[PDB]
Design a protein around this ligand. Structure first.
Ligand SMILES: C[C@@H]1O[C@@H](CC(=O)O)[C@@H](O)[C@H](O)[C@@H]1O
Ligand SMILES: C[C@@H]1O[C@@H](CC(=O)O)[C@@H](O)[C@H](O)[C@@H]1O
Ligand SMILES: C[C@@H]1O[C@@H](CC(=O)O)[C@@H](O)[C@H](O)[C@@H]1O
Ligand SMILES: C[C@@H]1O[C@@H](CC(=O)O)[C@@H](O)[C@H](O)[C@@H]1O
Ligand SMILES: [Ca+2]
Ligand SMILES: [Ca+2]
Ligand SMILES: [Ca+2]
Ligand SMILES: [Ca+2]
Ligand SMILES: [Ca+2]
Ligand SMILES: [Ca+2]
Ligand SMILES: [Ca+2]
Ligand SMILES: [Ca+2]
Lengths: 114, 6, 114, 114, 114
């Protein structure tokens, strides 16, 4: 099934934050309405924040996370969780190799903000 | 539905 | 029900990251084995990261997130979600007032690391 | 925080299923747009299905689960989870006593159907 | 990534329940420690329960859900969610055709029981 794609309400401010846990440099692309809106890149095996940014979901509300490592797309896992019918998390993990820890790039999207 | 069309 | 308490696997490194979305200054305390292991303090209405740290879940694995504003405990909501039976997120939202957006301090705990 | 309340898309069919794990008889009321649409009453200490039904979210999509035992409202916990941006689960647990297993009535809402 | 595989606490009773939303007859296999412990078969386009059972996670805690239609494995989506650090849901959706509603068999695993 498709992973890393989330429908947000239109024109909504949301946070996106990426962490790295791999010897390979992680490239995280965040697309809004099929266009690149943010790109994070960094290397860490200690969960360093490689990027954090506030974006807007635009007229379509379509947000997509893509992760690649040295040009190779990583395998993604994702889910959305809603607490008290209000607080939203869109969560992404990714695997760039064979150990299947799925933390090589971890991406957290959260809304509402403010 | 199980069918050639599907 | 109790919120903000999570049983992690023992002796496991985890990330804890706090975001702020409120006029109030958020004090986020992270307890491991019922003992204070990290304290964040910050204010933002734009999802700023007010703290991010790598901790060890220790011998008990018990991790607890407390949030207060000016000494008053915020109301917490939390859950844990696991993707592909491997990637773990422990999620906390909190409300310091009466609008019930539950984003005033948002805390994300993730493991495994590395 | 409020628990057991979920906003669904309007005019959408959803499944609601209740399981019992308690000596107390569980009364589960499922409200759609603030009016009861289904009521289940059963007792089991081994996860018996005490009710299952297809409902329609109606004009406004508001769905609320209430649980009571002998007229006493139980303490609720809840969350919503979305898989592949399409498959939705709304989850409710409830505690009627002091052991805090939160399984005394378990309610699972799922959509889309068909 | 692998879907439909969950590590439960060892030697723990859990409920497993399957719902059907498809023209095709769904076959749901539930494995514990790599051996079949339950099999459900049924057909419904109305979210009917095609099976519900109480199982024991055994010494390994490994539980796997498989879904197939006419010998063809369905595409699975899954996640585990924990509420108040106690109530666990292991959730599976599945797609047997072309429309990506992922509800053709829906499997809910819940614990603790009693
Ligand atoms: C240090 C390792 O880096 C990768 C492999 C090499 O490279 C990741 O896939 C592993 O999970 C781990 O973080
Ligand atoms: C009635 C249909 O049955 C299937 C297709 C044929 O078979 C499912 O995939 C569809 O989602 C729908 O439920
Ligand atoms: C800017 C506001 O700050 C608080 C109330 C005042 O202060 C928060 O509770 C609100 O949700 C909002 O973020
Ligand atoms: C059998 C027991 O029934 C209740 C208490 C008595 O009654 C529940 O709260 C417990 O969790 C347990 O299921
Ligand atoms: Ca890896
Ligand atoms: Ca890794
Ligand atoms: Ca608030
Ligand atoms: Ca706020
Ligand atoms: Ca109880
Ligand atoms: Ca119980
Ligand atoms: Ca289908
Ligand atoms: Ca279907």
């Amino acid at each position: 099934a498709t992973q890393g794609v989330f429908t947000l309400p239109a024109n909504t401010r949301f946070g996106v934050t990426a962490f790295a846990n791999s010897s390979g440099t992680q490239t995280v692309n965040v697309l809004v309405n099929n266009e690149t809106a943010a790109t994070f890149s960094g290397q860490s095996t200690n969960n360093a924040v490689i990027g954090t940014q506030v974006l807007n979901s635009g007229s379509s509300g379509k947000v997509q996370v893509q992760v690649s490592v040295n040009g190779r797309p990583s395998d993604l896992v994702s889910a959305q969780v809603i607490l008290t019918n209000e607080l939203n998390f869109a969560l992404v993990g990714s695997e760039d190799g064979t150990d299947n820890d799925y933390n090589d790039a971890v991406v957290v999207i959260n809304w509402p903000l403010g | 539905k199980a069918a050639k069309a599907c």
